[PDB]
Amino acid sequence: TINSVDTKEFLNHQVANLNVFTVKIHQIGWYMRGHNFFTLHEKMDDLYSEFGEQMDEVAERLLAIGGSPFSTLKEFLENASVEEAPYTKPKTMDQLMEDLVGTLELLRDEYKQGIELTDKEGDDVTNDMLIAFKASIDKHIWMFKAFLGKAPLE
Amino acid sequence: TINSVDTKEFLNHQVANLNVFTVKIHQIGWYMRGHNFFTLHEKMDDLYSEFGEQMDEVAERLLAIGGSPFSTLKEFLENASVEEAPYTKPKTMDQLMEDLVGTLELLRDEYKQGIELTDKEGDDVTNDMLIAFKASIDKHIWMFKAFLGKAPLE
Amino acid sequence: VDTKEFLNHQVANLNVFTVKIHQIGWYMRGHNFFTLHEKMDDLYSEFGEQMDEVAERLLAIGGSPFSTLKEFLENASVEEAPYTKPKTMDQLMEDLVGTLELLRDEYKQGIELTDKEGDDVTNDMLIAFKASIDKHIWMFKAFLGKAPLE
Amino acid sequence: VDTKEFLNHQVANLNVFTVKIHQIGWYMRGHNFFTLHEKMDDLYSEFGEQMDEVAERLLAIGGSPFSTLKEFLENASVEEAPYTKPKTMDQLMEDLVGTLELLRDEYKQGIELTDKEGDDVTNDMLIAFKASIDKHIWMFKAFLGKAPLE
Amino acid sequence: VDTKEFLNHQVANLNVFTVKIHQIGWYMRGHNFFTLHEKMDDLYSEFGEQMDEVAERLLAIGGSPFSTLKEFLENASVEEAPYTKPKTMDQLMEDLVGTLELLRDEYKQGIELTDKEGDDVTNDMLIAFKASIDKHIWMFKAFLGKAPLE
Amino acid sequence: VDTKEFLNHQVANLNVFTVKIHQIGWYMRGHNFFTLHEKMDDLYSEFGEQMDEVAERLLAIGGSPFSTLKEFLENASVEEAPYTKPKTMDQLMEDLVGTLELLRDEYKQGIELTDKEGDDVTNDMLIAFKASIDKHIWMFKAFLGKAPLE
Amino acid sequence: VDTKEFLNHQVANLNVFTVKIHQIGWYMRGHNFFTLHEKMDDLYSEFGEQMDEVAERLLAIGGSPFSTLKEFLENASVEEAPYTKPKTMDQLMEDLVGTLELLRDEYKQGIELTDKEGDDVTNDMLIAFKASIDKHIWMFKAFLGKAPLE
Amino acid sequence: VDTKEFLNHQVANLNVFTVKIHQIGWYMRGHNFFTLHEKMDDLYSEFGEQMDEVAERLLAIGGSPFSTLKEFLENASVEEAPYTKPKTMDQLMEDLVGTLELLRDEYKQGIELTDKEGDDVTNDMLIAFKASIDKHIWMFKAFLGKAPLE
Amino acid sequence: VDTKEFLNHQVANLNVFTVKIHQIGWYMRGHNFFTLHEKMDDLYSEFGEQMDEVAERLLAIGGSPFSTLKEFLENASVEEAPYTKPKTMDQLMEDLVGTLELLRDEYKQGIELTDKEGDDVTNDMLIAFKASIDKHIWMFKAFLGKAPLE
Amino acid sequence: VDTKEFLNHQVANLNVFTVKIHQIGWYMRGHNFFTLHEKMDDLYSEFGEQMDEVAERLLAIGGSPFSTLKEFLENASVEEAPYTKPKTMDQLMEDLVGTLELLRDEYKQGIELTDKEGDDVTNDMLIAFKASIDKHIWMFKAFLGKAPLE
Amino acid sequence: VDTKEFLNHQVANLNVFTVKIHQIGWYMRGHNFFTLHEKMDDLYSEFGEQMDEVAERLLAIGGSPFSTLKEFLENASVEEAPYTKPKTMDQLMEDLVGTLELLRDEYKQGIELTDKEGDDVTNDMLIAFKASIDKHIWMFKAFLGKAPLE
Amino acid sequence: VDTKEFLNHQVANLNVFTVKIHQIGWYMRGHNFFTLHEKMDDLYSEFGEQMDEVAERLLAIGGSPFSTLKEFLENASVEEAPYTKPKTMDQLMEDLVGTLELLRDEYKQGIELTDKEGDDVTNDMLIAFKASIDKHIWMFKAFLGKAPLE
After folding, report:
1. Residue I132 phi/psi, 5° resolution?
2. Domain of residue B129, residue span
3. In this structure, what CATH number is given to the domain that contains residue G32?
4. SS3 label, residue J127
5. Which alpha helices (DSSP H) does chain L contain, by range?
6. How many domains does chain D have?
7. d(CA L30, CA J8)
8. Contacts of B147 in chain D (CB under 8 A)
9. Which of K29, C117, C11, E53 lies closest to J142, judged by CA?
């Protein structure tokens, strides 16, 4: 059974995703415990600011193409494919990083869909914007997978 | 009929509030139109970062007092007294600023409750943290009310 | 028009635009003077930077950039008019947005052309420039109480 | 009045002016609040800096600067009034402009006087201050929808 | 006196004080000229910053700050005198310390008043200012070969 | 103990703590060496800054800070031991957190005492210090796989 | 010619000159490319800054600056030619030097005129610009193996 | 060759190139020593940065970068020769340009390959690097008195 | 071996070492990835800087530095191996430490030799490099849970 | 005494000295308070940095630095006394100078010992510290109206 | 004497002065050593910059600056004497002030001469230098407990 | 000659050298003017700093530095000549190089002497200076198309 997504709808979906992600980054940064706390907490603060910057750029690009960004938590929750769960039972640093990596992978793959879609639509600016963001996501995937003792695509 | 709030619960409520507020600041910054766009959009970007900083400080103070911050959009929405609405019908710059001022006023008054509560509980650090934040909120109230051609407490 | 001719055309355009940005910044009056004068100074620097990068990219692909005011005037599609009768801030901003739109649409032609010719570098350069132009269109349209594409 | 007396007069003037700048920055209301409030803080700093330079030039030429509010009040030609009735942004800016023009014209008298007395340093100092005042007059007049000398 | 009246009184006080700091910095002579003139410039900035913060805090609580030299003179408890007879560096520093002590003690009154009124922000603001004043008192008393509270 | 005696006690404590921070930074071994050695250097600077501010605040209230190692040892409640037998990173961090906790609880006594005595400045100073200590306790406890207050 | 007309003429000149500086910077070849290309970029910014200052000074004196390429071409004494046949670095530098000398000499006329009219600010502005031009003439003549006035 | 093999080839190439840049910077003699030695240092940093970015991109796509000098020599198309007989600045720059051209052309192959594979990130990375290479080609050809593609 | 030969040997060594540093930084996995990867980037830069300084000192003493990968490989005592089988973080750090120790000991031979030859500059240069190596050995040995000379 | 024991002795000395520098900085009174208090703060940081470098050098040579106040007191040749009776600025500076001379002379012993043992790094480290000490001796002796070695 | 001869004379003077500033900074002793030694370093930089600017202005006007110590000695009106008998800080400052006054007065002659010759740039240059000299005279006279022109 | 006499001789030398550097920077003409003029300004600052460090080291060892041009002329081995007949850039660089070699060789004598006398600080100071001189010799000889020791 079917459905269609344009550049505007793709961008708006990422506004929702990024907002869930950035809140998740904070969850990880706040609740983490273990020997790697100092470096990883700092790392979460860096990702929080970077993905918040991506979010704002996505929303403002959406604005520039005549779109209307989701701008409430209700709308972000109703639209995001990025999943969130309250922090209840204690999680290992590895478990937290696996959740982080899984979401980075989700965003990478969705951005790839976005890159293809925007190429088809001839939206070169949005296309290049998404490529630049994927570049950074790919680097983070390599690094965080390495933290987990894994290959980037393993 | 009754209910009680301690420092932990007050802080957690503000984590929820600040997250709704910061998203609202972005809504205002994104959707604003009119002669004051450049200065006010920039101003929204500044408030976004400032209130995001307050939020993180509130959550990390909560952590430091043995609390568990809300860390999902679901939890922020379920707990916030700060109200949000999707941007549907066009709003004037004044209307957007009135929504901003109203939320600043809400936070100021809640922070005052928080200041009194934390004073009673003997949590001096949280008390001073909240005072410093109220100081900034009061300054913003004066300025934004002045933008609206109004006295700070009018 | 090839990539070389497109680039050279933008060297001409950007030089007219940059002079127009100064006109607007110099002659503007009204309540938004301080913020918009500063914004004109920013745009002047940015579009002057675009111009030099266009001209130097042209050089790098074996071209010969226009390098006189006579050549810029003879070749530009961006229009200029002396400042005679007083214009409102909105009228000045409408001239600015109109020129931004002209540049955006011409750059889109340049993006297509350079993609056809397989000039990847010029392509990416023009895309980055268009990105900034699009942001400016949204903001300046917003100043005018309008949607970016209205 | 000689150079010493002229400078001392400006010490008095600038102290009234900086206090007026603050009044305008504190009491202003309206849509241009953010940019104009910030602009008042910039002017406050600039004119405070001119003031200190004037007083220190006066010291360097063997003078004795006024250094009390009583002395500033007794000597200044720049006028001040308490903020009672609400003033529009335009009214506050007209008050600012009027004071800028007063200072410009007095500085011109100072420039002439100092040239006649052969005090080349004080002369150049006054010229550089006038330069800034003239720029401010253009910009603030432009904010008011007026020509600089209108 | 309430918080608003206390704040407004300090706006008056700080404006007299900053002018005094300048008097001291301008007229000082002796072996400690270089370091103490620089120190006067630092204090001038600091106390002018406190003044602006007091006035803006007053604004934020629904007050109306004094904004003319006439109002500052009419209301200040900080005393000023024109520089007539030459003063020793020590005498200038004694005048400075005496004023710092006056402000510290009045701020202490303000801290207690604002605590009673439940104006937590103004309270903290005044405490932070007192902190700095206390440090200055120690240092300048030490320059005078005295204990801070001697 | 009064405010003066409490402050002087912290001058002693902070001097022992700062030397302990160096011990930990110097003797630490294990996988977290680079991040934790750097963190010890940061804490050394921060607690050295706290110490000087405590001592200078004491000076400002008419006190006489301890200013010899003999006096610090004679007065500190913070304990020190020479580094003899190898300690794990966790053991070093437990000593650090224990000392942070000691300081937090003592500062809380200081906060109460200084509130009783009406020394508002010292009160706020100690609160700001406690704020930082609390943040450090959370972080270092988190490193140890523990809740801040467990 | 009055001050306004002199200033407006320089707006035109500087716009032609800045475009010429880019011509030289873009088309230059030879062993001194890196140093001289960079030098052209610096001169471009500097003369662009003089131009804006001249135009804004003109505005401040009640003038109306030329603000189109058509106006600059129709009014400039500074000459331009398209780059057709290859020029030596020396030839490009001789064109640069010649234009600097033209501007120096015209500015000298402007200095004298502005002195006659009693426009002290414009006078000082033009002198400061001449100072820079004279320094560039010395250096670029030295590059050419010549004395500054040879 | 796939993206992984192309990237790995460039890791080899860039490591030979950076070493060559150093050779040129170390052994150069003549009148353009100062500017060109500095330029070699800039290129060394830039190309070492490209190398690291290529290797890290390779890592990010599941590759395994060459990470020994043996591997770089075994795989590079960029040629190296020990400095024996003295070379002119021009000859050193010709070797530099020739290598820049080799890299540009291979990057062009990489841009097309990665476009076909749908590796958008690697594609953009290579385009950005080519952009810089093209600018260098123009500039160094200009130093050699040549057109960029001559 | 003389000073020239010793230096040239270190040019070879440092080039193998920097490439090894990158290998370690690229291929590392485990919990210490973030801090150690960053540490590898720092060491890469530092040892690259030592390398350039060694080569340039060699130039300054009339020497001819190795300036090809072939020459570095043929001359280095620092060993390299391709990354094939997965290595633990400890194993990678042991490889790093071993190379640091090799360099330290060779530098010591260099320090002795250069002292005997009376090359005071090269002597001091080597001493300063050893200082840094010794600090690194302590820190990396500490990471490995070992004493510096264990 | 060997290098390790010499270094460890200096760890002790520098810790006593740094505390003494604070004693002087805190208790000083007189006309030179501002300059000298600041100077004490600079010396505090500098000697604290020497101390950490000595301790870390000790670590790098397989040593175990003293890392408790008890150890510093039991091993230091630098003497300390509590501040009881008021001291003149000169008296405080004489205590400072005497301790600098003590450290200079001991460092000279350390330089000779370290030269004998062939510990080139520690040698150079101690020489660089002596250089600074000798500069401070000249300056502080000059403050006291004395020749450096008088 | 013309502008060229006047300028060349100041090249001579400033070179003697700068060397004198160093004499004063090197040989000074007494309580004000730290502040005044630093002040001498500041003056040395400033007057060295004036010197270079004078010499380069001379170059720009077709002159030939003195560029040997022999020429500076043969031409300077500024007097120098070897430091033999110990001088008081006041004596050293009196020599400084005397030379500052000499320079001020000669610059005043230069200002008049250059105005007569219509050398506007040199005129403004000398005025800016005098400005600073006058400020230094006020400050150093104040140090000596004297009025600037006393 | 002892350390004190050697140092004082270099105070003399560096002052002649610095004046020579300015001569070269002022009078130079030719294609390399921009790069080399800037290089002269860099050398002037560097050798002026060496000079001050030499003089202050002399002070620290109980010496009395030459502090007049008469003393520098009477004592310097570095030769100076007025600029009369035009010199080639190469001729000027040959004079620079020759003086750098003179200084290097005398510093080498100073290094030996100071090692004999056991003045470790002066020794290291001179070595650091030689380090830079050697680097300059390599670079300037390379400019002249020569090997460093040729």
Report:
1. -70, -45
2. 1-154
3. 1.20.1260.10
4. helix
5. 3-27, 33-60, 69-75, 89-116, 120-143
6. 1
7. 60
8. 29-31, 33-34
9. K29
